[PDB]
Amino acid sequence: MAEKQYDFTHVPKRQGNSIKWGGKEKELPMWIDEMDFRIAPEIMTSMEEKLVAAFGYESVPAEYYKAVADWEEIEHARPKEDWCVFASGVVPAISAMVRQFTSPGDQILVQEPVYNMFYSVIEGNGRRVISSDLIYESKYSVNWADLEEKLATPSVRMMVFCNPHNPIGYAWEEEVKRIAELCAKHQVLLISDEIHGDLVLTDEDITPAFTVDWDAKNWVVSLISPSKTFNLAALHAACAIIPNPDLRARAEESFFLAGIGEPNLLAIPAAIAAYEEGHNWLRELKQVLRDNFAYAREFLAEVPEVKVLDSNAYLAWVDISALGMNAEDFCKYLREKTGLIISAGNGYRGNGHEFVRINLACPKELVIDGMQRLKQGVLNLNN
Amino acid sequence: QYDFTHVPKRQGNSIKWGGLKEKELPMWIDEMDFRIAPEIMTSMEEKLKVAAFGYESVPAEYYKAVADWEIEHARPKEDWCVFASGVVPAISAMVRQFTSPGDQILVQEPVYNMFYSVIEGNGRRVISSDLIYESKYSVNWADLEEKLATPSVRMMVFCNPHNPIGYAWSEEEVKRIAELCAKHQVLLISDEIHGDLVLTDEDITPAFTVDWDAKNWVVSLISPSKTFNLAALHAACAIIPNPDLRARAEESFFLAGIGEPNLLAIPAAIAAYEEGHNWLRELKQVLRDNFAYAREFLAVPEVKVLDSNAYLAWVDISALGMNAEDFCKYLREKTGLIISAGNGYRGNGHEFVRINLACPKELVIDGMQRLKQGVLNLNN
Numbered sequence: 049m050a051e052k053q054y055d056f057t058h059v060p061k062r063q064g065n066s067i068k069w070g071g072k073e074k075e076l077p078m079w080i081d082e083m084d085f086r087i088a089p090e091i092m093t094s095m096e097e098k099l100v101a102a103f104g105y106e107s108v109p110a111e112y113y114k115a116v117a118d119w120e121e122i123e124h125a126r127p128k129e130d131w132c133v134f135a136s137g138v139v140p141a142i143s144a145m146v147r148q149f150t151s152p153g154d155q156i157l158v159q160e161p162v163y164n165m166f167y168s169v170i171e172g173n174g175r176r177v178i179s180s181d182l183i184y185e186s187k188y189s190v191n192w193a194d195l196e197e198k199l200a201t202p203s204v205r206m207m208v209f210c211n212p213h214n215p216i217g218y219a220w221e222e223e224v225k226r227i228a229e230l231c232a233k234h235q236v237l238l239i240s241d242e243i244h245g246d247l248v249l250t251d252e253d254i255t256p257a258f259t260v261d262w263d264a265k266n267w268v269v270s271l272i273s274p275s276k277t278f279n280l281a282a283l284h285a286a287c288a289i290i291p292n293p294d295l296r297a298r299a300e301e302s303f304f305l306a307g308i309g310e311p312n313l314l315a316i317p318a319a320i321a322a323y324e325e326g327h328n329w330l331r332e333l334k335q336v337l338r339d340n341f342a343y344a345r346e347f348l349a350e351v352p353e354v355k356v357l358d359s360n361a362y363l364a365w366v367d368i369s370a371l372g373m374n375a376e377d378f379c380k381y382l383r384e385k386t387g388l389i390i391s392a393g394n395g396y397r398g399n400g401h402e403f404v405r406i407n408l409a410c411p412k413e414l415v416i417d418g419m420q421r422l423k424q425g426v427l428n429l430n431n
Numbered sequence: 432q433y434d435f436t437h438v439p440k441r442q443g444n445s446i447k448w449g450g451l452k453e454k455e456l457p458m459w460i461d462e463m464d465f466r467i468a469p470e471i472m473t474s475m476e477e478k479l480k481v482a483a484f485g486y487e488s489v490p491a492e493y494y495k496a497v498a499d500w501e502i503e504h505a506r507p508k509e510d511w512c513v514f515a516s517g518v519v520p521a522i523s524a525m526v527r528q529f530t531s532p533g534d535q536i537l538v539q540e541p542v543y544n545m546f547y548s549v550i551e552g553n554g555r556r557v558i559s560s561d562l563i564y565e566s567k568y569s570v571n572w573a574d575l576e577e578k579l580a581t582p583s584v585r586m587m588v589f590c591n592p593h594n595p596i597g598y599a600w601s602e603e604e605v606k607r608i609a610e611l612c613a614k615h616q617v618l619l620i621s622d623e624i625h626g627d628l629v630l631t632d633e634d635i636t637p638a639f640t641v642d643w644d645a646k647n648w649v650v651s652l653i654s655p656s657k658t659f660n661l662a663a664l665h666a667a668c669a670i671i672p673n674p675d676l677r678a679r680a681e682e683s684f685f686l687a688g689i690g691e692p693n694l695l696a697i698p699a700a701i702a703a704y705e706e707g708h709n710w711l712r713e714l715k716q717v718l719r720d721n722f723a724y725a726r727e728f729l730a731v732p733e734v735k736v737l738d739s740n741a742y743l744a745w746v747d748i749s750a751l752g753m754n755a756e757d758f759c760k761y762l763r764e765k766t767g768l769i770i771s772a773g774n775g776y777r778g779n780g781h782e783f784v785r786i787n788l789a790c791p792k793e794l795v796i797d798g799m800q801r802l803k804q805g806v807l808n809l810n811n
């Protein structure tokens with residue numbers, strides 16, 4: 049092969065409070081959205097240098113927005129640094145922007161099936177989910193007429209738009225300006241969560257919503273973070289990109305009010321290192337991930353009873369309807385007999401009750417064992 | 432056994448130290464100029480070597496560390512305990528969950544200015560039963576009960592030990608307040624983030640210790656952040672005896688996005704609560720020393736360091752007849768010493784300065800001379 053500068057073979061050893069690896073003998077979790085790779089050693093170096101030995105209150109330096117705008121220029125479209133505001137997390141920032149830009153009672157449009165934490169922060173904040181469901185016929189599709197009639201609804205004040213879309217792994221262009229343009233037209237804030245934007249495995253690119261014509265650029269917020277990209281979920285560093293100057297200043301005051309406007313001790317130095325010294329680690333990763341998807345899509349093509357969707361952005365969305373069993377029970381039964389743990393599609397709503405989600409961001413050895421645990425689980429049902 | 436003489440060299444984005452002029456001495460904002468406990472430090476660099484930082488739950492050891500630590504004071508039941516990334520944000524979330532917009536929320540002015548940000552910024556209304564200032568503050572118990580009895584007063588933010596006065600309330604006072612709140616079905620939020628830093632052996636009585644008339648109406652908030660110089664760790668704990676109250680506050684932490692620990696919060700905090708007793712014992716001796724050196728030097732008799740039993744020195748400048756802000760502004764100007772104006776704390780704060788003493792005695796030396804220097808140029 050072409051020798052990889054960095055280690056994509058060795059599974060980090062987590063402490064016992066890890067959600068993914070914490071709490072049975074010979075069990076294999078591929079459900080929760082975090083990698084099983086060591087982070088880039090260039091980020092590790094930045095973290096270690098910061099650990100000054102006194103960790104008092106921290107401000108957000110102009111060097112953070114500069115690394116952010118640079119990464120987005122080099123890897124995708126350069127935002128203005130003035131557009132940027134730090135927040136400690138994507139979902140935290142959404143939740144605060146729900147509380148800031150909508151009222152209790154207001155509806156918030158999503159596209160089911162979608163990341164299950166969207167429902168929690170909309171419903172838990174006393175707003176109401178409305179969905180222009182995604183049409184499934186081995187691809188999903190947008191019922192645009194149904195999308196427009198929901199946006200025009202007076203009580204529909206926000207669209208939370210997954211770009212690219214978890215869990216179907218779909219990277220939306222042109223579709224994104226339409227969506228922006230329809231939001232603007234009906235005066236609906238478009239919140240573009242782009243947390244998976246860097247992990248497009250095809251060289252299709254994501255279209256950040258902040259790049260839309262000024263006709264609609266005043267109705268958009270893009271959210272990025274290094275977190276899913278460099279395996280730093282617990283770093284609590286994200287970035288809202290908000291061109292409308294009043295919008296942005298109001299987002300920022302609510303981040304403060306919520307307690308998610310100030311960086312923790314490593315959020316600044318590690319994020320800057322990722323955004324400025326992480327291109328080469330990512331490019332290599334993307335080769336390991338492409339290789340894992342190929343291996344998995346190919347092996348499942350041994351299990352004809354399931355149908356993987358055509359992804360274009362590391363999670364595999366797998367159609368298990370043929371087994372004629374509910375994904376919650378399948379995932380339960382599959383676990384108890386094989387020790388493989390994958391995430392049932394129920395929680396993602398839409399047609400999720402027919403699907404399962406398998407996280408392939410792990411060394412190939414675990415992709416093999418995983419896929420084959422899955423084949424075992426299927427074989428036992430037919431016997 | 433531990434270093435309290437050399438000031439950590441911060442990166443450029445420190446609030447306290449970032450972007451200061453030459454020859455400027457920051458003694459205003461509440462973080463220390465000491466390196467942290469090596470045992471804490473250790474746990475941080477071990478966690479880092481994991482080299483992958485995905486989602487972390489809160490382990491029961493975190494609540495056991497917290498209960499064991501509370502040796503220092505009172506043992507909360509481990510089930511009562513709920514992680515949140517910080518004290519003020521959990522105050523912010525409990526305001527939104529437990530009151531309605533327009534409701535009133537009672538402080539005892541003068542108090543820590545962040546209490547007004549979270550009360551007013553959430554569209555709630557501040558009402559104060561001012562503490563009666565007579566070189567010390569006292570409580571008007573008649574006034575406090577009338578206000579708590581007002582139907583639109585739904586909550587009370589109680590600072591215990593009370594910042595900026597530096598006063599750790601009596602077991603008597605603490606339970607009397609909890610009885611009145613419960614009498615009048617007002618929720619009592621006990622900010623106890625300074626409880627580990629009472630300089631006298633006069634220990635804090637955490638609101639969670641009050642008995643079952645009123646234990647159902649209390650919430651205690653603690654945190655290693657002030658004690659161990661960890662404001663950027665984002666690790667804290669709410670102690671909430673009432674379980675239906677506890678379950679609700681927990682879902683409000685999760686929606687605010689403060690209910691989940693960062694990559695360091697859990698192991699550093701467990702390190703602090705399990706092994707930081709000796710480090711802290713030695714910190715407190717450094718602080719009684721600098722408090723001692725501070726009051727004797729100022730006794731500047733036109734100012735009055737009033738009796739603090741817990742490291743921010745609340746200094747009365749009423750005899751110089753100068754507004755705190757205009758004073759602290761003029762001080763920074765000619766002398767370079769930066770100190771917190773009392774105005775932001777409301778009450779009678781505009782006649783007081785707050786002075787941070789958690790720095791090596793040499794910086795305390797330099798600051799006190801600077802302050803005296805200032806007081807003399809006003810008279811020339």
Ligand SMILES: C=CC[S@](=O)C[C@H](N)C(=O)O
Binds near residue numbers: 067079080082165486
């Ligand atoms: C604790 C359960 C919710 S979990 O942390 C959300 C995560 N991105 C996932 O992939 O499920």
